Design a protein. Structure first.
Length: 66
DNA sequence: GTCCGATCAACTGTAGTTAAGCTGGTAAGAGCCTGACCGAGTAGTGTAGTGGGTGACCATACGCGAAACTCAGGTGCTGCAATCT
C-alpha cells in the first residue's frame, strides 16, 4: 500500500548498489560488522564504511604530516 | 492511528584493565568400555472351545428276478350205452 515509499526504497537501493556498495556490505552492516582501524596503536571502530574510510584517510593525512 | 518532543542510552571524541603461556610436577574436568539390573519388547506359546467334514453303518426305495400258491388245464381208462352188423 505504501507505493511511493516502496518506490523510494527500491530506487534508493539501486542508487546505493551503484554507489560502490557490493550489496554484501548492506547485509554485513545488519549482521553486526563494525569496521576497525589497522594502523599501529589505533583500534577505533565504525558502524558504516564511509566513517571507516574517513578514519583511514586521517591516517594517510598523519603519514603526510610525518 | 498519529502527533509533539522529552529523554535512556545509541554511537560518538580518548584513558587505563583483561588473557595466553612460560619451568614444573600435579589433581582437576570430561571421559571410555566391560560389566551388572531391572523394565519393557518381540512374539510364539498354552490350554480350551466351536465348528465342519470324513467315515461307517443303516434302511429305504425301485426294479429284476426267484420261488410261492391258486385255480383250472390235461391225461387215460372204462361204465354204460348205441351204431353197425
Ligand atoms: Zn586508526
Amino acid at each position: 500500500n505504501n507505493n511511493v515509499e516502496f518506490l523510494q526504497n527500491e530506487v534508493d537501493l539501486e542508487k546505493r548498489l551503484e554507489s560502490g556498495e557490493n550489496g554484501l556490505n548492506l547485509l554485513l552492516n545488519t549482521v553486526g560488522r563494525k569496521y576497525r582501524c589497522f594502523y599501529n596503536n589505533c583500534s577505533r571502530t565504525f558502524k558504516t564504511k564511509e566513517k571507516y574510510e574517513k578514519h583511514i584517510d586521517k591516517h594517510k593525512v598523519h603519514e603526510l604530516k610525518l
